[PDB]
PDB file of C-alpha atoms and ligand atoms in Angstrom:
ATOM      1  CA  UNK A   1     146.593  11.743 141.883  1.00  0.00           C
ATOM      2  CA  UNK A   2     147.028  15.681 140.727  1.00  0.00           C
ATOM      3  CA  UNK A   3     144.298  16.684 138.097  1.00  0.00           C
ATOM      4  CA  UNK A   4     142.084  13.342 138.580  1.00  0.00           C
ATOM      5  CA  UNK A   5     138.485  12.654 138.493  1.00  0.00           C
ATOM      6  CA  UNK A   6     136.573  10.482 140.741  1.00  0.00           C
ATOM      7  CA  UNK A   7     136.765   7.071 139.495  1.00  0.00           C
ATOM      8  CA  UNK A   8     133.573   5.282 139.329  1.00  0.00           C
ATOM      9  CA  UNK A   9     133.037   2.398 142.090  1.00  0.00           C
ATOM     10  CA  UNK A  10     133.529  -0.803 139.620  1.00  0.00           C
ATOM     11  CA  UNK A  11     136.217   1.012 137.404  1.00  0.00           C
ATOM     12  CA  UNK A  12     139.483  -0.762 138.492  1.00  0.00           C
ATOM     13  CA  UNK A  13     138.720  -3.705 140.542  1.00  0.00           C
ATOM     14  CA  UNK A  14     142.356  -4.676 140.858  1.00  0.00           C
ATOM     15  CA  UNK A  15     143.469  -1.677 142.774  1.00  0.00           C
ATOM     16  CA  UNK A  16     144.139  -2.002 146.484  1.00  0.00           C
ATOM     17  CA  UNK A  17     145.120   0.198 149.429  1.00  0.00           C
ATOM     18  CA  UNK A  18     148.220  -0.596 151.126  1.00  0.00           C
ATOM     19  CA  UNK A  19     147.845   0.245 154.734  1.00  0.00           C
ATOM     20  CA  UNK A  20     150.105   0.395 157.764  1.00  0.00           C
ATOM     21  CA  UNK A  21     149.340   0.562 161.805  1.00  0.00           C
ATOM     22  CA  UNK A  22     149.331   4.187 163.102  1.00  0.00           C
ATOM     23  CA  UNK A  23     148.660   4.061 166.801  1.00  0.00           C
ATOM     24  CA  UNK A  24     145.409   2.591 167.189  1.00  0.00           C
ATOM     25  CA  UNK A  25     144.138   3.238 163.524  1.00  0.00           C
ATOM     26  CA  UNK A  26     145.040   2.027 160.330  1.00  0.00           C
ATOM     27  CA  UNK A  27     146.304   4.589 157.618  1.00  0.00           C
ATOM     28  CA  UNK A  28     146.910   4.422 153.667  1.00  0.00           C
ATOM     29  CA  UNK A  29     150.497   4.773 152.640  1.00  0.00           C
ATOM     30  CA  UNK A  30     150.632   3.129 148.983  1.00  0.00           C
ATOM     31  CA  UNK A  31     148.472   1.402 146.122  1.00  0.00           C
ATOM     32  CA  UNK A  32     148.857  -1.661 144.512  1.00  0.00           C
ATOM     33  CA  UNK A  33     147.404  -4.169 142.068  1.00  0.00           C
ATOM     34  CA  UNK A  34     145.790  -7.679 143.157  1.00  0.00           C
ATOM     35  CA  UNK A  35     147.523 -10.178 140.463  1.00  0.00           C
ATOM     36  CA  UNK A  36     146.418 -13.451 142.054  1.00  0.00           C
ATOM     37  CA  UNK A  37     143.651 -13.916 144.840  1.00  0.00           C
ATOM     38  CA  UNK A  38     146.704 -13.971 147.591  1.00  0.00           C
ATOM     39  CA  UNK A  39     149.145 -11.672 145.821  1.00  0.00           C
ATOM     40  CA  UNK A  40     149.516  -8.231 145.410  1.00  0.00           C
ATOM     41  CA  UNK A  41     152.207  -6.138 143.442  1.00  0.00           C
ATOM     42  CA  UNK A  42     153.387  -2.795 144.810  1.00  0.00           C
ATOM     43  CA  UNK A  43     156.500  -0.631 145.122  1.00  0.00           C
ATOM     44  CA  UNK A  44     159.335  -2.037 146.928  1.00  0.00           C
ATOM     45  CA  UNK A  45     159.755   1.432 148.568  1.00  0.00           C
ATOM     46  CA  UNK A  46     156.454   1.279 150.254  1.00  0.00           C
ATOM     47  CA  UNK A  47     157.469  -1.657 152.004  1.00  0.00           C
ATOM     48  CA  UNK A  48     160.822  -0.421 153.273  1.00  0.00           C
ATOM     49  CA  UNK A  49     159.832   0.847 156.700  1.00  0.00           C
ATOM     50  CA  UNK A  50     159.203  -2.241 159.072  1.00  0.00           C
ATOM     51  CA  UNK A  51     155.724  -1.645 159.689  1.00  0.00           C
ATOM     52  CA  UNK A  52     152.692  -3.980 160.066  1.00  0.00           C
ATOM     53  CA  UNK A  53     150.644  -3.766 156.789  1.00  0.00           C
ATOM     54  CA  UNK A  54     147.070  -4.189 155.818  1.00  0.00           C
ATOM     55  CA  UNK A  55     145.620  -4.721 152.162  1.00  0.00           C
ATOM     56  CA  UNK A  56     142.234  -3.534 151.505  1.00  0.00           C
ATOM     57  CA  UNK A  57     140.464  -4.622 147.982  1.00  0.00           C
ATOM     58  CA  UNK A  58     136.887  -3.482 147.293  1.00  0.00           C
ATOM     59  CA  UNK A  59     137.664  -0.059 148.311  1.00  0.00           C
ATOM     60  CA  UNK A  60     136.682   3.029 147.334  1.00  0.00           C
ATOM     61  CA  UNK A  61     136.353   5.992 149.960  1.00  0.00           C
ATOM     62  CA  UNK A  62     139.280   5.683 152.679  1.00  0.00           C
ATOM     63  CA  UNK A  63     137.149   7.590 155.187  1.00  0.00           C
ATOM     64  CA  UNK A  64     133.731   5.595 155.172  1.00  0.00           C
ATOM     65  CA  UNK A  65     132.032   2.305 154.875  1.00  0.00           C
ATOM     66  CA  UNK A  66     131.146   1.154 150.987  1.00  0.00           C
ATOM     67  CA  UNK A  67     129.881  -2.177 152.225  1.00  0.00           C
ATOM     68  CA  UNK A  68     132.615  -3.745 149.615  1.00  0.00           C
ATOM     69  CA  UNK A  69     135.678  -3.885 151.543  1.00  0.00           C
ATOM     70  CA  UNK A  70     137.640  -7.112 152.543  1.00  0.00           C
ATOM     71  CA  UNK A  71     140.544  -6.571 155.027  1.00  0.00           C
ATOM     72  CA  UNK A  72     143.533  -9.002 154.870  1.00  0.00           C
ATOM     73  CA  UNK A  73     146.759  -8.736 156.449  1.00  0.00           C
ATOM     74  CA  UNK A  74     150.313  -9.318 154.589  1.00  0.00           C
ATOM     75  CA  UNK A  75     151.860 -12.455 155.552  1.00  0.00           C
ATOM     76  CA  UNK A  76     155.156 -12.408 153.460  1.00  0.00           C
ATOM     77  CA  UNK A  77     156.876  -9.577 151.687  1.00  0.00           C
ATOM     78  CA  UNK A  78     159.167 -10.295 148.720  1.00  0.00           C
ATOM     79  CA  UNK A  79     161.426  -7.137 147.523  1.00  0.00           C
ATOM     80  CA  UNK A  80     163.186  -7.505 144.134  1.00  0.00           C
ATOM     81  CA  UNK A  81     166.974  -8.568 145.349  1.00  0.00           C
ATOM     82  CA  UNK A  82     168.428  -5.774 143.388  1.00  0.00           C
ATOM     83  CA  UNK A  83     166.466  -3.044 145.013  1.00  0.00           C
ATOM     84  CA  UNK A  84     168.145  -0.537 147.122  1.00  0.00           C
ATOM     85  CA  UNK A  85     166.386   1.954 149.236  1.00  0.00           C
ATOM     86  CA  UNK A  86     169.149   4.590 148.490  1.00  0.00           C
ATOM     87  CA  UNK A  87     168.579   4.495 145.030  1.00  0.00           C
ATOM     88  CA  UNK A  88     164.985   4.659 143.381  1.00  0.00           C
ATOM     89  CA  UNK A  89     166.773   5.889 140.025  1.00  0.00           C
ATOM     90  CA  UNK A  90     168.351   2.419 139.450  1.00  0.00           C
ATOM     91  CA  UNK A  91     164.745   0.828 139.252  1.00  0.00           C
ATOM     92  CA  UNK A  92     163.757  -2.339 140.672  1.00  0.00           C
ATOM     93  CA  UNK A  93     160.945  -0.800 142.521  1.00  0.00           C
ATOM     94  CA  UNK A  94     158.893  -3.703 142.864  1.00  0.00           C
ATOM     95  CA  UNK A  95     157.542  -6.015 145.675  1.00  0.00           C
ATOM     96  CA  UNK A  96     155.179  -8.965 145.942  1.00  0.00           C
ATOM     97  CA  UNK A  97     153.121  -9.306 149.079  1.00  0.00           C
ATOM     98  CA  UNK A  98     151.900 -12.635 149.868  1.00  0.00           C
ATOM     99  CA  UNK A  99     148.339 -12.077 151.849  1.00  0.00           C
ATOM    100  CA  UNK A 100     147.352 -14.227 155.063  1.00  0.00           C
ATOM    101  CA  UNK A 101     143.895 -15.212 153.096  1.00  0.00           C
ATOM    102  CA  UNK A 102     142.779 -15.355 149.634  1.00  0.00           C
ATOM    103  CA  UNK A 103     140.256 -12.708 148.611  1.00  0.00           C
ATOM    104  CA  UNK A 104     136.762 -13.030 147.000  1.00  0.00           C
ATOM    105  CA  UNK A 105     136.595 -11.878 143.571  1.00  0.00           C
ATOM    106  CA  UNK A 106     133.165 -10.111 142.599  1.00  0.00           C
ATOM    107  CA  UNK A 107     132.515  -6.887 140.480  1.00  0.00           C
ATOM    108  CA  UNK A 108     134.633  -4.866 143.088  1.00  0.00           C
ATOM    109  CA  UNK A 109     137.553  -6.928 143.352  1.00  0.00           C
ATOM    110  CA  UNK A 110     139.353  -8.723 140.365  1.00  0.00           C
ATOM    111  CA  UNK A 111     142.845  -9.458 139.007  1.00  0.00           C
ATOM    112  CA  UNK A 112     144.905  -6.849 137.062  1.00  0.00           C
ATOM    113  CA  UNK A 113     145.829  -8.252 133.866  1.00  0.00           C
ATOM    114  CA  UNK A 114     149.738  -8.203 133.008  1.00  0.00           C
ATOM    115  CA  UNK A 115     151.333  -7.623 129.833  1.00  0.00           C
ATOM    116  CA  UNK A 116     153.369 -10.098 127.879  1.00  0.00           C
ATOM    117  CA  UNK A 117     157.128 -10.087 128.842  1.00  0.00           C
ATOM    118  CA  UNK A 118     159.000  -7.600 126.765  1.00  0.00           C
ATOM    119  CA  UNK A 119     156.044  -5.304 125.907  1.00  0.00           C
ATOM    120  CA  UNK A 120     156.854  -1.499 125.338  1.00  0.00           C
ATOM    121  CA  UNK A 121     154.062   0.761 124.345  1.00  0.00           C
ATOM    122  CA  UNK A 122     154.393   3.458 121.417  1.00  0.00           C
ATOM    123  CA  UNK A 123     154.426   7.166 122.341  1.00  0.00           C
ATOM    124  CA  UNK A 124     151.415   8.586 123.700  1.00  0.00           C
ATOM    125  CA  UNK A 125     149.550   5.462 124.439  1.00  0.00           C
ATOM    126  CA  UNK A 126     146.297   5.619 126.410  1.00  0.00           C
ATOM    127  CA  UNK A 127     146.890   5.326 130.130  1.00  0.00           C
ATOM    128  CA  UNK A 128     145.233   5.786 133.217  1.00  0.00           C
ATOM    129  CA  UNK A 129     146.735   6.251 136.978  1.00  0.00           C
ATOM    130  CA  UNK A 130     144.585   5.402 139.756  1.00  0.00           C
ATOM    131  CA  UNK A 131     145.172   5.965 143.608  1.00  0.00           C
ATOM    132  CA  UNK A 132     144.276   7.719 146.765  1.00  0.00           C
ATOM    133  CA  UNK A 133     147.494  10.166 146.702  1.00  0.00           C
ATOM    134  CA  UNK A 134     147.831  13.747 147.171  1.00  0.00           C
ATOM    135  CA  UNK A 135     145.515  15.693 144.785  1.00  0.00           C
ATOM    136  CA  UNK A 136     148.021  18.505 144.964  1.00  0.00           C
ATOM    137  CA  UNK A 137     151.592  18.954 145.707  1.00  0.00           C
ATOM    138  CA  UNK A 138     152.216  19.102 149.331  1.00  0.00           C
ATOM    139  CA  UNK A 139     148.360  18.807 149.885  1.00  0.00           C
ATOM    140  CA  UNK A 140     146.453  15.918 151.332  1.00  0.00           C
ATOM    141  CA  UNK A 141     145.271  12.331 150.270  1.00  0.00           C
ATOM    142  CA  UNK A 142     142.191  12.053 148.456  1.00  0.00           C
ATOM    143  CA  UNK A 143     139.206  10.159 150.028  1.00  0.00           C
ATOM    144  CA  UNK A 144     137.921   8.630 146.939  1.00  0.00           C
ATOM    145  CA  UNK A 145     139.748   6.850 144.254  1.00  0.00           C
ATOM    146  CA  UNK A 146     140.949   9.156 141.675  1.00  0.00           C
ATOM    147  CA  UNK A 147     141.702   8.734 138.101  1.00  0.00           C
ATOM    148  CA  UNK A 148     143.665  10.735 135.474  1.00  0.00           C
ATOM    149  CA  UNK A 149     144.280  10.144 131.985  1.00  0.00           C
ATOM    150  CA  UNK A 150     148.285   9.814 131.648  1.00  0.00           C
ATOM    151  CA  UNK A 151     149.687   8.853 127.936  1.00  0.00           C
ATOM    152  CA  UNK A 152     153.070   7.579 127.965  1.00  0.00           C
ATOM    153  CA  UNK A 153     156.180   9.077 127.218  1.00  0.00           C
ATOM    154  CA  UNK A 154     158.596   6.600 125.507  1.00  0.00           C
ATOM    155  CA  UNK A 155     162.275   5.954 126.607  1.00  0.00           C
ATOM    156  CA  UNK A 156     163.826   8.320 124.051  1.00  0.00           C
ATOM    157  CA  UNK A 157     161.970  11.338 124.936  1.00  0.00           C
ATOM    158  CA  UNK A 158     161.784  10.573 128.681  1.00  0.00           C
ATOM    159  CA  UNK A 159     165.539   9.989 128.868  1.00  0.00           C
ATOM    160  CA  UNK A 160     166.410  13.421 127.155  1.00  0.00           C
ATOM    161  CA  UNK A 161     167.558  16.348 128.471  1.00  0.00           C
ATOM    162  CA  UNK A 162     164.394  18.430 128.897  1.00  0.00           C
ATOM    163  CA  UNK A 163     162.731  15.306 130.342  1.00  0.00           C
ATOM    164  CA  UNK A 164     164.225  12.794 133.196  1.00  0.00           C
ATOM    165  CA  UNK A 165     167.420  12.506 131.374  1.00  0.00           C
ATOM    166  CA  UNK A 166     169.547   9.712 132.768  1.00  0.00           C
ATOM    167  CA  UNK A 167     167.602   9.369 135.847  1.00  0.00           C
ATOM    168  CA  UNK A 168     164.934   7.092 133.794  1.00  0.00           C
ATOM    169  CA  UNK A 169     166.055   3.698 132.641  1.00  0.00           C
ATOM    170  CA  UNK A 170     164.554   1.323 129.991  1.00  0.00           C
ATOM    171  CA  UNK A 171     162.833  -0.841 133.216  1.00  0.00           C
ATOM    172  CA  UNK A 172     160.707   2.163 133.597  1.00  0.00           C
ATOM    173  CA  UNK A 173     157.726   3.644 131.726  1.00  0.00           C
ATOM    174  CA  UNK A 174     157.060   7.542 131.918  1.00  0.00           C
ATOM    175  CA  UNK A 175     153.763   8.855 131.438  1.00  0.00           C
ATOM    176  CA  UNK A 176     152.003  12.285 131.374  1.00  0.00           C
ATOM    177  CA  UNK A 177     154.232  15.515 132.320  1.00  0.00           C
ATOM    178  CA  UNK A 178     151.768  17.932 131.013  1.00  0.00           C
ATOM    179  CA  UNK A 179     152.164  19.948 134.348  1.00  0.00           C
ATOM    180  CA  UNK A 180     148.360  19.286 135.151  1.00  0.00           C
ATOM    181  CA  UNK A 181     147.664  15.906 135.843  1.00  0.00           C
ATOM    182  CA  UNK A 182     150.132  13.190 137.611  1.00  0.00           C
ATOM    183  CA  UNK A 183     150.839  10.857 140.488  1.00  0.00           C
ATOM    184  CA  UNK A 184     151.865  12.275 143.776  1.00  0.00           C
ATOM    185  CA  UNK A 185     152.446  10.996 147.303  1.00  0.00           C
ATOM    186  CA  UNK A 186     150.547   8.010 148.305  1.00  0.00           C
ATOM    187  CA  UNK A 187     149.985   6.816 144.756  1.00  0.00           C
ATOM    188  CA  UNK A 188     153.317   4.853 144.386  1.00  0.00           C
ATOM    189  CA  UNK A 189     152.768   1.027 144.235  1.00  0.00           C
ATOM    190  CA  UNK A 190     149.496   1.690 142.653  1.00  0.00           C
ATOM    191  CA  UNK A 191     148.714   0.555 138.737  1.00  0.00           C
ATOM    192  CA  UNK A 192     149.114   2.466 135.321  1.00  0.00           C
ATOM    193  CA  UNK A 193     146.124   0.931 133.462  1.00  0.00           C
ATOM    194  CA  UNK A 194     147.073   1.284 129.586  1.00  0.00           C
ATOM    195  CA  UNK A 195     144.437   0.232 126.768  1.00  0.00           C
ATOM    196  CA  UNK A 196     145.858  -2.551 124.714  1.00  0.00           C
ATOM    197  CA  UNK A 197     143.749  -4.387 122.035  1.00  0.00           C
ATOM    198  CA  UNK A 198     140.924  -3.269 123.551  1.00  0.00           C
ATOM    199  CA  UNK A 199     141.529  -4.510 127.189  1.00  0.00           C
ATOM    200  CA  UNK A 200     143.345  -2.536 130.074  1.00  0.00           C
ATOM    201  CA  UNK A 201     146.523  -4.025 131.315  1.00  0.00           C
ATOM    202  CA  UNK A 202     148.667  -2.986 134.245  1.00  0.00           C
ATOM    203  CA  UNK A 203     152.044  -1.654 132.555  1.00  0.00           C
ATOM    204  CA  UNK A 204     153.250   0.393 135.505  1.00  0.00           C
ATOM    205  CA  UNK A 205     153.866   0.514 139.064  1.00  0.00           C
ATOM    206  CA  UNK A 206     154.200   4.034 140.491  1.00  0.00           C
ATOM    207  CA  UNK A 207     157.267   4.625 141.513  1.00  0.00           C
ATOM    208  CA  UNK A 208     158.314   8.317 141.630  1.00  0.00           C
ATOM    209  CA  UNK A 209     157.946  11.971 140.481  1.00  0.00           C
ATOM    210  CA  UNK A 210     159.978  14.979 140.714  1.00  0.00           C
ATOM    211  CA  UNK A 211     161.212  16.369 143.881  1.00  0.00           C
ATOM    212  CA  UNK A 212     160.364  19.843 142.490  1.00  0.00           C
ATOM    213  CA  UNK A 213     156.445  18.666 142.689  1.00  0.00           C
ATOM    214  CA  UNK A 214     154.015  16.159 141.602  1.00  0.00           C
ATOM    215  CA  UNK A 215     152.567  18.074 138.650  1.00  0.00           C
ATOM    216  CA  UNK A 216     155.821  19.188 136.702  1.00  0.00           C
ATOM    217  CA  UNK A 217     155.770  19.896 133.033  1.00  0.00           C
ATOM    218  CA  UNK A 218     158.079  17.546 131.221  1.00  0.00           C
ATOM    219  CA  UNK A 219     158.726  15.451 134.249  1.00  0.00           C
ATOM    220  CA  UNK A 220     156.179  12.657 133.886  1.00  0.00           C
ATOM    221  CA  UNK A 221     155.144  10.156 136.791  1.00  0.00           C
ATOM    222  CA  UNK A 222     157.939   7.228 136.598  1.00  0.00           C
ATOM    223  CA  UNK A 223     156.851   3.703 136.865  1.00  0.00           C
ATOM    224  CA  UNK A 224     158.462   0.360 136.928  1.00  0.00           C
ATOM    225  CA  UNK A 225     157.694  -1.257 133.739  1.00  0.00           C
ATOM    226  CA  UNK A 226     155.674  -4.604 134.769  1.00  0.00           C
ATOM    227  CA  UNK A 227     156.736  -6.263 131.372  1.00  0.00           C
ATOM    228  CA  UNK A 228     160.358  -6.004 132.342  1.00  0.00           C
ATOM    229  CA  UNK A 229     159.716  -8.379 135.311  1.00  0.00           C
ATOM    230  CA  UNK A 230     157.051 -11.061 134.425  1.00  0.00           C
ATOM    231  CA  UNK A 231     159.621 -13.838 134.832  1.00  0.00           C
ATOM    232  CA  UNK A 232     160.605 -12.626 138.333  1.00  0.00           C
ATOM    233  CA  UNK A 233     156.896 -12.460 139.303  1.00  0.00           C
ATOM    234  CA  UNK A 234     156.066 -15.843 138.142  1.00  0.00           C
ATOM    235  CA  UNK A 235     158.958 -17.460 139.944  1.00  0.00           C
ATOM    236  CA  UNK A 236     158.346 -15.748 143.110  1.00  0.00           C
ATOM    237  CA  UNK A 237     154.557 -16.927 142.995  1.00  0.00           C
ATOM    238  CA  UNK A 238     155.855 -20.263 141.699  1.00  0.00           C
ATOM    239  CA  UNK A 239     158.173 -20.820 144.671  1.00  0.00           C
ATOM    240  CA  UNK A 240     156.101 -18.842 147.588  1.00  0.00           C
TER     241      UNK A 240
HETATM  242  C1  0Z4 B 301     153.884   9.861 142.899  1.00  0.00           C
HETATM  243  C2  0Z4 B 301     154.843   9.293 143.981  1.00  0.00           C
HETATM  244  C3  0Z4 B 301     155.276   7.902 143.487  1.00  0.00           C
HETATM  245  C4  0Z4 B 301     155.911  10.294 144.130  1.00  0.00           C
HETATM  246  C5  0Z4 B 301     157.445   9.954 144.132  1.00  0.00           C
HETATM  247  N1  0Z4 B 301     157.756   9.240 145.482  1.00  0.00           N
HETATM  248  C6  0Z4 B 301     158.908   8.425 145.676  1.00  0.00           C
HETATM  249  O1  0Z4 B 301     159.591   8.114 144.701  1.00  0.00           O
HETATM  250  C7  0Z4 B 301     159.019   7.922 147.157  1.00  0.00           C
HETATM  251  C8  0Z4 B 301     159.914   6.642 147.165  1.00  0.00           C
HETATM  252  C9  0Z4 B 301     161.265   6.992 147.908  1.00  0.00           C
HETATM  253  C10 0Z4 B 301     162.236   8.016 147.236  1.00  0.00           C
HETATM  254  C11 0Z4 B 301     163.687   7.674 148.212  1.00  0.00           C
HETATM  255  N2  0Z4 B 301     164.572   8.796 147.539  1.00  0.00           N
HETATM  256  N3  0Z4 B 301     157.743   7.667 147.356  1.00  0.00           N
HETATM  257  C12 0Z4 B 301     157.068   8.227 148.423  1.00  0.00           C
HETATM  258  O2  0Z4 B 301     157.665   8.877 149.289  1.00  0.00           O
HETATM  259  C13 0Z4 B 301     155.529   7.807 148.374  1.00  0.00           C
HETATM  260  F1  0Z4 B 301     154.892   8.543 149.576  1.00  0.00           F
HETATM  261  F2  0Z4 B 301     155.187   8.443 147.582  1.00  0.00           F
HETATM  262  F3  0Z4 B 301     154.835   6.600 148.582  1.00  0.00           F
HETATM  263  C14 0Z4 B 301     158.401  11.186 144.635  1.00  0.00           C
HETATM  264  O3  0Z4 B 301     158.145  12.307 145.201  1.00  0.00           O
HETATM  265  N4  0Z4 B 301     159.743  10.947 144.152  1.00  0.00           N
HETATM  266  C15 0Z4 B 301     160.857  11.293 144.338  1.00  0.00           C
HETATM  267  C16 0Z4 B 301     161.284  12.369 145.144  1.00  0.00           C
HETATM  268  C17 0Z4 B 301     162.476  12.633 145.716  1.00  0.00           C
HETATM  269  C18 0Z4 B 301     163.186  11.749 145.256  1.00  0.00           C
HETATM  270  C19 0Z4 B 301     164.790  11.824 146.166  1.00  0.00           C
HETATM  271  C20 0Z4 B 301     165.811  12.236 145.073  1.00  0.00           C
HETATM  272  C21 0Z4 B 301     164.823  12.451 147.552  1.00  0.00           C
HETATM  273  C22 0Z4 B 301     162.974  10.553 144.850  1.00  0.00           C
HETATM  274  C23 0Z4 B 301     161.870  10.200 144.364  1.00  0.00           C
HETATM  275 CA1   CA B 302     135.587   2.449 153.084  1.00  0.00          CA
END
């Protein structure tokens, strides 16, 4: 997260760190949202490499014991059938991970609230990006969970010339784009939490920023629109 601030420890209890084995240690690669006690929603491109993956819930500082973490292995990955590795701009950047065991819910580990199917936010809606991703373009991962206020940019403004043009679709949410605050590498897969009828719901799964850099003016962070996939998500948990 560029231009973030340190989140409090109990502010976003549905945030997870998706980690892969790195020699003899584990390294963070992506965020995600805990959506059932044994299911994580993350970005499809985070699970394209055929790595062994770890999910950590109750995580606040990647590099030191918090006394709140629960570590669980991924047992099955379900990427969206339409996702194509070569085309982030086509969309469908979403995957569901079934965990080896159910997590214990407490004030640090909670399920994320999903929107009703079809829900589009109006322009400038209050939203927050969270993650441990790079704090600068071509910089380094944060140690502690960062958060940045990233208001949405609706489809018409985002798919316009000056902004993302045709690269964004209606199955995506854009948010931010002020040139100060943004998602950045390592934040992919994570939540965009937007305030809706007094309740924070997860409306985005972080998917991409500009190739020019993370915090670029009129190039908001682009998220997969969760409410475009509620039937797909329910159908996977239903059969799996
Ligand atoms: C905030 C995160 C989401 C940053 C965002 N990352 C991405 O979209 C890529 C997904 C794979 C793209 C394959 N072309 N994600 C990552 O590499 C990450 F580390 F962040 F997880 C990015 O840099 N977006 C981007 C940059 C370049 C491209 C291609 C034109 C190379 C596509 C997307
Ligand atoms: Ca820790």
